[PDB]
Design a protein around this nucleic acid. Structure first.
Lengths: 70, 64, 135, 88, 272
RNA sequence: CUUGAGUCUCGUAGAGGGGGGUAGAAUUCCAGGUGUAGCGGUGAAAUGCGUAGAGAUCUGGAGGAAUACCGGUGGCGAAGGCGGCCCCCUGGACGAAGACUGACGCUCAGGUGCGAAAGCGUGGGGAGCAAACAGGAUUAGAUACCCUGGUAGUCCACGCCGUAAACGAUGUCGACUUGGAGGUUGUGCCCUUGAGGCGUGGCUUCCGGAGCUAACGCGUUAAGUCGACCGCCUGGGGAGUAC
RNA sequence: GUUUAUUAAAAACACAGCACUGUGCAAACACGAAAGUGGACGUAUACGGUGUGACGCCUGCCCGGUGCCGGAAGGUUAAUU
């Protein structure tokens, strides 16, 4: 996961962020552990869970003003 | 390590280098900087890290 | 009927076996009041990673519509053809059998980017121009 | 799910001659035609429990509609059961 | 088919039998029976040299075509019969030109089918092909050991010699011994298994099955006396030497192979 | 009668079920090419494997579980439950108009049918991992803790009693009670300018009112208002065993 | 079932299955001066031989010593130049 995508102008330090778009994730991340078939369905699927923090954050900006912290 | 190997191969008579990379392990950049310090150009830092189509079950490791 | 997009590829040196089998298969399709809505040969092309040896194979895209019965004798036959390395047969839902996305790239391949060699004369004897031995 | 031209044979032979789909006889004959289609699958496939879920819907409703029909017109019942050749 | 006993008598407990409706329930046509007879283990000298062979039924013999050569001609598949002299079922094929053979059974047995030869025609079981023209992973029925020597590999019911490579000039196929060989592509084989595929749930179930198959019983070596077999014991049987046959070859050892004619084709063999 | 429910043709999404076909990469393995000394493991380590040339690396094939990411708040099933890709067989659900029958209804002891996973008999098969078992390491128990080898197993066809954390720990089906917005889909309308809006259904998910709760928490997918009928409980241990 | 003809008729022996292994078919193996033939004209779901002994549940450690199979890089090595 130095990533095959070539960094603009070649250098000895890979620009690993700017190279990667969806690599290592799922594919080379679960190293040396017993592989389950169906566990992801209940283990991993936390999209619903992260959607709550994004709403909450968009609510609180108006509310800090209404408290006059802002 | 990179420097150990790069010295000896001058007798095989090599002058320019490319690299294939295969792993999640440490030494990501610092092994490349040393290949560059043997006087070689290293324009191609090519990942070929093989992803099987979900291969053989790995060692369980800890009992949790 | 239900629409079955069969595409398959063939090893060059064993290819001489398939030109007799495809023309019995197209006849089993139109013989049942299904249709061949194109029958496109693409010529020989490079595989990225080898399948059943050699880094090249020869491609035929059928664009079938056919009844379910007929497709049951055919799938078992193309899959157990030695000349064929692999085949894939695609779903009825939202399925095209006309206006090929790869029609230009097929012509380009056939006309100009082919092998142009004797082992691939064996492939042009397996496309739309099929010739096969007398039994 | 059944062919237009078979569904039309069933409607012709069952219910009244008005050529409806809604009447007690023809709903029995249509339920059967799916049971018979299901029984083509269940000639093998004996462990196939998610489809079986459907078989107990279709049987139950054919029992319910014959039970209704002998409560309803007696001509329709006595004709239907013998015309659709069910049981032994 | 196979027919299995309900365990309704002593001696009938574990007993399995071979039956087909297609077997003639008359006696087979004796003008096509060319006499077996058995030799009770005895060679030219009048000695038993194959030991614990002897007894049982006469068990008559059919020539069997194990080469399957015919250009394009139909077979009605006139009957499927049990052969009491081998494990496989054997068909009487009666060709529509007036020729009768005995032929070893395929996975095919369709009436009015044709035993074909040549590339574009063969793709069903029993229809001949050079082995180059048969796909990888195929189970395959009855293989010629070398071209024109005849089908010496996979003859017993539902056994098979499954293709595991077929690239290059040769065919690689696996044998049920644990051996794996390359075999020249000019040999004949067919797709699908050998016939009578349900044979493999057979159990025998009585000492009498082996008796009519002409197999005589056989002692423990340790339960002979030291004089009658060298493995035989003293007081209280005394298994406690290394094991041997009655003629002195270490039975759980040795590699004796000296074929020196076909050794070029085996690229690995079974090992201890 | 329709106001319940049932049903026809029309349209739409998907890993629901069962059985078949089939490939390559990494581990593993063969063949060949090249090449020298450690490789491997973990908190850290030793046991393991290796000069008979390992490890690694290039080329092509092999074999068998598995099929990455795609796999999402997505979609399917009755609860458990569903994932390579495909075909063969087949369910149930979602929209929408025209029409049809007209309480044909609800619940349900017993009941037949039916498994997440492993158990399990015989046939076909078996690369890696692993209970057990060894040995290392730890803290005296691989069988507390941690690692390495390593066997039955895991895998398939069929066959035997369906267990649990069978669920938003919440039975069923149905009537009734302010909604907004997201994910995402049938579909009227719109720079379809906004996975958006409005029009109307769909699962799915955030949010909170009337009400309810010991408390968290629920709230139109109830843990609210109710309806009928079923399942099941009545202090703990000992007992999910006894009988 | 077989059994020391009669005083052991069994617990020994047998057998399916179960586990081990040789054998790829001009087989392994056997006897025979050797030609040869049996095995088998069958042939791996087949054949020779070993231990245990249908059937439900299984089968822990381990080669020190003793017997036997097997495998290789190579220093030399009989016979021999």
């Amino acid at each position: 996961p130095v990533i095959k995508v070539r960094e603009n102008e070649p250098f000895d330090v890979a620009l690993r962020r700017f190279k990667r778009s969806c690599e290592k994730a799922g594919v080379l991340a679960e190293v040396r552990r017993r592989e389950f078939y169906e566990k992801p369905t209940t283990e991993r699927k936390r999209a619903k869970a992260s959607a709550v923090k994004r709403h909450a954050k968009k609510l609180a900006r108006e509310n800090a003003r209404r408290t006059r912290l802002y | 390590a990179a420097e150990r190997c790069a010295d000896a191969v001058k007798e095989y008579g090599i002058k320019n280098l490319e690299v294939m990379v295969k792993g999640p392990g440490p030494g990501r950049e610092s092994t490349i900087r040393a290949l560059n310090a043997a006087g070689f150009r290293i324009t191609n830092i090519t990942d070929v890290t093989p992803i099987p189509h979900n291969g053989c079950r790995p060692p369980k490791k800890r009992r949790v | 009927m239900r629409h079955y997009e069969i595409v398959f590829m063939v090893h060059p040196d064993q290819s001489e076996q398939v030109p007799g089998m495809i023309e019995r298969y197209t006849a089993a399709i139109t013989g049942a009041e299904g249709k061949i809505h194109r029958l496109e040969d693409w010529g020989r092309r490079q595989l990225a990673y080898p399948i059943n040896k050699l880094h090249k194979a020869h491609y035929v895209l059928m664009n079938v519509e056919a009844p379910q019965e007929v497709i049951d004798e055919l799938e078992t036959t193309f899959r157990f053809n030695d000349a064929v390395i692999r085949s894939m047969v695609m779903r009825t839902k939202h399925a095209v059998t006309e206006a090929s996305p790869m029609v230009k790239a097929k012509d380009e391949r056939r006309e100009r980017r082919d092998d142009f060699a004797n082992e691939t004369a064996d492939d042009a004897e397996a496309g739309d121009s099929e010739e096969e031995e007398e039994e | 799910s059944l062919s237009t031209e078979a569904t039309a044979k069933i409607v012709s032979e069952f219910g009244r001659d008005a050529n409806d789909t809604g009447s007690t006889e023809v709903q029995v004959a249509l339920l059967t035609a799916q049971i018979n289609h299901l029984q083509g699958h269940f000639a093998e496939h004996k462990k196939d429990h998610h489809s079986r879920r459907g078989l107990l819907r279709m049987v139950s409703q054919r029992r319910k509609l014959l039970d209704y029909l002998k409560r309803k017109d007696v001509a329709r019942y006595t004709r239907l059961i013998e015309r659709l050749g069910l049981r032994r | 088919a196979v027919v299995k006993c309900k365990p309704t008598s002593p001696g009938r407990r574990h007993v399995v039998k071979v039956v087909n409706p297609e077997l003639h329930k008359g006696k087979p046509f004796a003008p096509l029976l060319e006499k077996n007879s058995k030799s009770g283990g005895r060679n030219n000298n009048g000695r038993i040299t194959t030991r614990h062979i002897g007894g049982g039924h006469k068990q008559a013999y059919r020539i069997v075509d194990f080469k399957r050569n015919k250009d394009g001609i139909p077979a009605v598949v006139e009957r499927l019969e049990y052969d009491p002299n081998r494990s496989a079922n054997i068909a009487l094929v009666l060709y529509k030109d007036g020729e009768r053979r005995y032929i070893l059974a395929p996975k095919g047995l369709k009436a009015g089918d044709q035993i074909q030869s040549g590339v574009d025609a063969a793709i069903k079981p029993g229809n001949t092909l050079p082995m180059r023209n048969i796909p990888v992973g195929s189970t395959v029925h009855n293989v010629e050991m070398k071209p024109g020597k005849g089908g010496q590999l996979a003859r017993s019911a539902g056994t098979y010699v499954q293709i595991v490579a077929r690239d290059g000039a040769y065919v690689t196929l696996r044998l049920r011994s644990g051996e794996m060989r390359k075999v020249e592509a000019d040999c004949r084989a067919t797709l699908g298994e050998v016939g009578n595929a349900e044979h493999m749930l057979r159990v025998l179930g009585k000492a009498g099955a082996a008796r009519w198959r002409g197999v005589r019983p056989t002692v423990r070596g340790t339960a002979m006396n030291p004089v009658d077999h060298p493995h035989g014991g003293g007081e209280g049987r005394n298994f406690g030497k290394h094991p041997v046959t009655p003629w002195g070859v270490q039975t759980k050892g040795k590699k004796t192979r000296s074929n020196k004619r076909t050794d070029k084709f085996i690229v690995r063999r079974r090992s201890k």
